[PDB]
């Protein structure tokens, strides 16, 4: 159909010249057919097989019949006349036909015709697309349909590129075609020019038939010689013109070296650099279309770029996620903060930023993100989490975030995932970095700029650090909580920590310290300490903690502690004490000068019994001694009137004392994992207890009175 | 229209060859029709049903219409 | 033949095919 | 194609429907490939699921 | 905006038409009078006719 675009101008000239050649061929042919005459006469006097050429004049008499003239005509026409003058137009016709065959072969040959029709179909449906003219115009909101049309179109282009890249059949055949045309050109010029001069008007012929006429020689005349002569001159002129065109085509094609399409002009001009160069059998088509019209090349080139595809992904992504769908996907988290968690998308849907109630944004493993200005709509945003997501940003969104952000979490592999702009912020209150903060010979260059974050109240670092950074202690004027989880890598403290007078909670976690340092005693504001995994065996240094009047929580689990120092009785303000998962052999009574304790956890130690002095915890509410080998409970345990939970499961208890009835406020109790046969009825005496709260095996539970179980049934739904 | 896909290349070549054959057929036919001549003369001296093949020259007279 | 080629063209022209091939 | 694209549950073809495919192959294998998908039962199952 | 090809071609076209016009008028009118009904010709063949 629309193969006009394929044909170049020289092909057009060849076509029309061929039509003209065919025209004159047909004309000469029909002229030969309709009269085919030669006019012969004898010659009386002969000299060297030629005419001697030696009262009014009189006509000559030869004494011949009209039919004999025709006989001798046919004979001298058959024999002595030269074949070229006879069969000129037939040959010309043949030549024209084989030219045209060579011309239209590669259209009519199917193996290539399929590739051509498929190619041009793709090209025309690509050129007609609206997103092409938009993308070129770029140098909103779009329909669902056309987006999918474009996506299907991209993949069509891709599979087509993969399919055509290997072949290299069309180029070879076009090459062979041109070469055939040129060699045939040369040959016809050769013999045509060699034999053209042989045409003549007059001919002398000696045929040697005496018996039929009695004359030896004849002189004959051929009227159409002149006309064929001029036609042949005109012919060879046209042919020369044709062959020069073909030679120009050949020179162009062999010079240009078309197997690789250079393509550089558009990518330099329009700044779409990420397009590769083209390989054989798909470059040649583009060269031809360039010869027709350069515009289609530019209009087609856009789909090859991946940036255009990425932008189209962003546009479909903004198009797809409706607001109502996102609203149902949101989650209100444990801190009553509305959050959204996304992972492994191509970018940020713009519809996100109309969810005006959002307060925490999380981005995980999303490449090449840029923060758009619509983030200014999220007036309630307080936290941003960037897990392996580098982010670009411009000034308006940046200013909004400078003025409206409280916390930043970053999980990174290296510096490339650290946005440089974070250090220009001013309202941040928390920073959380996960990854190595150092590089070879460049320790802590990544954090030199922390000094500008003048409002940071909490810093946590999980970065496998050899030392405490100088910049941290420099920023320690206003920092309140510092937490290092070093994962067993030894931390060096070296006298800088003493500057942090504002510090109220310190956690030096998995730093293989092996001894509580003495710098801690100058931190007179400390309220809580956690010394996870430091292989601590003795903790006598806690005597000097007696000056930390707000120390309420000491966290020393999973260490090698063998005993509790006696001076614990001087930490009268303690509310939480965790010494579970240790090697403790006994409980000092001095522990029970801490009469404000609510929580004590001594599970998974080597305790055999509970001292009677446990009655002194008048403020005790919850208690876990799980997974020891206690056989029975002391009576004095029930002097702790304020108890609400008692976790004693998975012990070797043989009996449960009746005095459990006295625990008015008990709602949760563990007795599981014992070899009890029944339970004591007095468990029913607990007012605030429920069926879900009485945590015990069902067969043991069944032993209670039915009335108790009925009251538990009532209690649940009330 | 749609049956182009069915025809293989050899069928195509057969088709065009047939066109050429028909062309030369028609040409030879019309050429035969439009002139259909043969030109005969007698032979005076005969040898075995063939010609013996035995003051300027003069034309021969057969005295025929 | 006409029935066959009709089937063939409407199969080639079908939209599900390009998805089915793209999945690999 | 069944080895390449991993749609193994297509039987071989019998007379008078193979010949057509051979011809279309001589014209262009691509139509044969695009047509082969519908023969698979996995295609029907997957479309049912989709 | 850049091209300026169409104008040039149309220009050349018109010029060729006009110069060709002039030439054909010239020699046509120059040679037309030579056509005549009757002609005398001396061909110099005595041997064939006398």
Curated annotation (Swiss-Prot), chain B:
Residues of the full protein shown: 15 to 102 of 810
Changes seen on gene knockout: Increased prenatal and postnatal mortality, growth retardation, and multiple tissue abnormalities. B-cell development is slightly impaired, without affecting B-cell function. Mice however show a cell-autonomous early block in thymocyte development and impairs peripheral T-cell expansion and function. Conditional deletion in germ cells leads to abnormal sperm and male infertility: the cytoplasm of late spermatids appears swollen, preventing reduction of the cytoplasm during further development into spermatozoa.
Recorded name of the encoding gene: Lrrc8a
Impact noted for substituting residue 34 to D: Abolishes activity in hypotonic solution
Maturation and modification: N-glycosylated.
Noted disease: Defects in Lrrc8a are the cause of ebouriffe (ebo), a spontaneous mutation that causes male sterility. Spermatozoa present in the epididymis display severe malformations, mostly of the tail. A drastic decrease of the spermatid population is observed, whereas spermatogonia and spermatocytes seem moderately affected. Defects are caused by decreased volume-regulated anion channel (VRAC) activity in germ cells. Oogenesis is not affected but embryos derived from ebo/ebo females show early developmental failure.
Spans traversing the lipid bilayer: 9-33
Origin: domain of life: Eukaryota
Originating organism: Mus musculus
Glycosites: 52
Name used for this protein in its record: Volume-regulated anion channel subunit LRRC8A
Disulfide cysteine pairs (residue numbers): 43-51
Physiological role: Essential component of the volume-regulated anion channel (VRAC, also named VSOAC channel), an anion channel required to maintain a constant cell volume in response to extracellular or intracellular osmotic changes. The VRAC channel conducts iodide better than chloride and can also conduct organic osmolytes like taurine. Mediates efflux of amino acids, such as aspartate and glutamate, in response to osmotic stress.
From Swiss-Prot, chain C:
Gene responsible for this protein: Lrrc8a
Post-translational modification summary for this protein: N-glycosylated.
Record's protein name: Volume-regulated anion channel subunit LRRC8A
Annotated compartments: Cell membrane; Lysosome membrane
Complexes and interactors: Heterohexamer; oligomerizes with other LRRC8 proteins (LRRC8B, LRRC8C, LRRC8D and/or LRRC8E) to form a heterohexamer. Can form homohexamers in vitro, but these have lower conductance than heterohexamers. In vivo, the subunit composition may depend primarily on expression levels, and heterooligomeric channels containing various proportions of the different LRRC8 proteins may coexist. Interact with GRB2. Interacts with NOX4; this interaction prevents the ubiquitin-mediated degradation of LRRC8A.
Tissue expression pattern: Ubiquitously expressed. High levels detected in the bone marrow; lower levels found in peripheral blood cells. Highly expressed in pancreatic beta cells.
Function: Essential component of the volume-regulated anion channel (VRAC, also named VSOAC channel), an anion channel required to maintain a constant cell volume in response to extracellular or intracellular osmotic changes. The VRAC channel conducts iodide better than chloride and can also conduct organic osmolytes like taurine. Mediates efflux of amino acids, such as aspartate and glutamate, in response to osmotic stress.
Signal peptide: none
Organism whose genome encodes this protein: Mus musculus
